[PDB]
Subunit: 87 residues, 2 copies
Amino acid sequence: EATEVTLKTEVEAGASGYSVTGGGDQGIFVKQVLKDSSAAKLFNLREGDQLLSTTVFFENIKYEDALKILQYSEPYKVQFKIRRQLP
Amino acid sequence: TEVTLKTEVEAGASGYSVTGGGDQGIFVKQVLKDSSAAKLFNLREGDQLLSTTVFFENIKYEDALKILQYSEPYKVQFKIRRQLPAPQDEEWA
Ligand SMILES: [K+]
């Protein structure tokens, strides 16, 4: 279980140029990362990293994309950050 | 005037709908009385969903990948667990 670090990335946009593997009975792991990718340069994703979670910010997001994220995440553990008006 | 909060971590959020997007944010539109949304997440009509965190625990690979693909254009933040080089720094004779 060591040496092992659990961290959060910065909040950045446009994560791409990486692949994942695993899942089901296993965790989700980064398989490959393209050298010049946002994955590498902005998120510092590395081969072998376990993605414990992803937080998606619903800012300037297409309705259909937000909807599909909610639909595909539906069976699993999630946490919402909400803004609520006080009357 | 308004408050920002986080739900508990729970599985199976359903029995609700959303609206908005694009220029606007994403808002909760109808919440079924008898729903996980109401009972586990305490979602209410009019709540803005600022973000969703999905935990990749017992997640079907194809569902996780679709989330990452649909998320691609947008602001995200990952929680990562990284194994780091083991090394042997023996010092003893
Ligand atoms: K897609």
